[PDB]
């Protein structure tokens, strides 16, 4: 896998973000995670975690899988970099997200993630408080 640029366009929500890229404005869906939504326990704080990672960021990257690359809303399919750290994996990390959607060829880091939620579930955090 290999990293490419993009370029904030606003903050969506915790696994949500629109992003330009290759000169054209997209929504991101993040790889492997769900966030829970705005109006949920946890929403409000998702979202602003993912806020300002996004949004204090010099340089934010993009990362595609091996399988497909947008799903059938017309999201992209990415791992999100803020200054080289990953945002699926901070939120996953921090109790924000719950590892999810785990599809077959887009799994690639998996098992990143699954070691953050652990160590996530052992301090208790947020969702598993
Ligand atoms: C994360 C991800 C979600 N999706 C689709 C599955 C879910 O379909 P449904 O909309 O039918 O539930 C939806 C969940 O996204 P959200 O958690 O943003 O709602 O997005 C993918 O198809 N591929 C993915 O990698
Ligand atoms: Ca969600």
Known sequence: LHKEPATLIKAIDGDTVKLM??????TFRLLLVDTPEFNEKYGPE???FTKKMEENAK???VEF?????TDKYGRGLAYIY???KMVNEALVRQGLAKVAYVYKGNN???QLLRKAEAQAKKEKLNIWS
């Open 82 to 84: 803020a200054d080289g």
């Open 65 to 69: 899988d091996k399988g497909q690359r």
């Open 108 to 110: 690639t880091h998996e």
């Open 46 to 48: 998702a979202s602003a």
């Open 21 to 26: 890229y290759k000169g054209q404005p997209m």
């Open 59 to 61: 340089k934010i990257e």
